[PDB]
Paper text:
While all the staphylococcal [name] phages encode Duts; some encode dimeric and others trimeric Duts, never both. Importantly, dimeric and trimeric Duts are completely unrelated both in sequence and structure, representing a nice example of convergent evolution. We conclude from these results that dimeric ϕO11 Dut induces the SaPI cycle using the same mechanism described for the unrelated trimeric Dut proteins.
To test this hypothesis, and since the structure of the staphylococcal phage-encoded dimeric Duts remains unsolved, the structure of the dimeric ϕO11 Dut in complex with the nonhydrolyzable dUTP analog α,β-imido-dUTP (dUPNPP) and Mg2+ was determined at 2.1 Å resolution. The structure shows that ϕO11 is an all-helix protein composed of only seven α-helices (α1, residues 7–23; α2, 29–47; α3 61–82; α4, 86–98; α5, 104–108; α6, 110–121 and α7, 127–141) per protomer. Interestingly, the ϕO11 dimeric Dut has a ‘compact’ conformation compared to counterparts in other organisms (which encompass ten or more α-helices). Nevertheless, the ϕO11 protomer presents the characteristic structural core of dimeric Duts composed of four helices (α1-α3 and α7 in ϕO11) that conforms the active centre where the nucleotide binds. In the ϕO11 dimer both active centres are oriented towards the same molecule face, forming a long channel that accommodates two molecules of dUPNPP. The rest of the protomer is placed on the opposite molecule face (residues 83–138), which corresponds to the divergent region in phage-encoded dimeric Duts but also adopts a helical fold (helices α4-α6 in ϕO11). In trimeric Duts, the α-phosphates acquire a gauche catalytic-competent geometry meanwhile a trans conformation is observed in the dimeric ϕO11 Dut. Furthermore, the β and γ phosphates differ in their relative disposition, chelating a single divalent metal in the trimerics, versus two in the dimerics.
Numbering used by the authors:
A (entry chain A): 4 to 160
B (entry chain B): 3 to 158
Write the structure that this text describes.
């Protein structure tokens, strides 16, 4: 489950971090988003018929999804997403955005090449992946721990 | 930094010797696998990582992922029953880098995958092109032979 309250906190956590990066820009953020999608997808390992038991540990799957959510939030922030949009977007946590596991990669690249990345899809997909394959609370906990870590790493440099 | 048909034919035989040990081998999964290794390799370049002072993973890591991409490219070529005619005509497609520079290779790769899919020629071509343009052919072949040896030992 996900409230507008919770989503608003997520975006605030992301903004606090992104404000510490002067070179921050949407082009790189969108490329980075796509790359974390494949980092995540490579932890699920649906296609690896050469492994007896495919799939990396749950905490590893969640921490890449957390990475993907980070850039989705950042895109929505940098794009100046409005409350009006967020509130129309939450009742869409019951959509088939994550598609099915066998088509999600293909689908993802199609939407990217054709339509590009907008604030709504970039936010929606990692939340919707979490709702359908994990839990939203599992993702939020992974995400909060990761950003604290990211902050501690930025202090070093 | 040259590639002969003899060399390419040796790589294909190396790839088949490994793939014959994988009874679940199928084209659909190999194509998905190929796309994923592309992004594994792309993420070793870290060109987009403005939040890093010194972006880029070590050379051995970049080459190991480029070797993975060559592996699935060779595998796709093998499963598709690639012909001598096609290989000998493909080698003249080294030379011309054409397509991608570094700031566009991700978007270029995805465009091609979506619009054309993965064919025997393109999937084999790309990692050889990349080796020619950012590393050397020799470096990729050496990295590929080390990786496959590790792969076999892992299947043991
Ligand atoms: O502008 C940024 C940059 C990075 N980040 C965070 C998100 C994510 O947790 C992480 C992504 O950066 P990296 O790709 O460097 N980390 P990752 O763990 O994915 O390393 P790698 O790509 O090597 O697997 O940094 C932001 O939130 N905003
Ligand atoms: O059918 C196959 C399957 C795998 N392989 C080899 C190629 C490549 O070197 C490697 C790819 O399998 P993994 O993705 O499981 N290994 P990788 O190094 O990419 O690990 P990871 O995906 O976790 O980064 O196994 C084949 O040659 N044919
Ligand atoms: Mg990353
Ligand atoms: Mg990551
Ligand atoms: Mg891999
Ligand atoms: Mg790899």
């Amino acid at each position: 489950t996900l409230t507008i309250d919770q989503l608003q906190e997520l975006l605030q956590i992301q903004k606090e971090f992104d404000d510490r990066i002067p070179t921050l820009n949407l082009r790189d953020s969108k490329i980075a988003y796509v790359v974390e999608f494949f980092e995540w997808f490579n932890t699920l390992e649906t296609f690896k018929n050469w492994k007896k038991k495919p799939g990396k540990p749950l905490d590893v799957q969640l921490d890449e999804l957390a990475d993907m959510l980070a850039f989705g939030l950042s895109i929505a922030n940098q794009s100046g997403v409005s409350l009006k949009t967020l509130e129309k977007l939450i009742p869409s946590t019951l959509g088939k955005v994550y598609f099915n596991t066998s088509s999600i990669m293909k689908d993802f690249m199609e939407d990217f090449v054709y339509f590009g990345l907008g604030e709504e899809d970039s936010l929606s997909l990692p939340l919707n992946i979490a709702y359908n394959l994990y839990s939203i609370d599992q993702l939020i906990d992974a995400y909060k721990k990761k950003m604290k870590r990211n902050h501690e790493r930025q202090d070093g440099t």
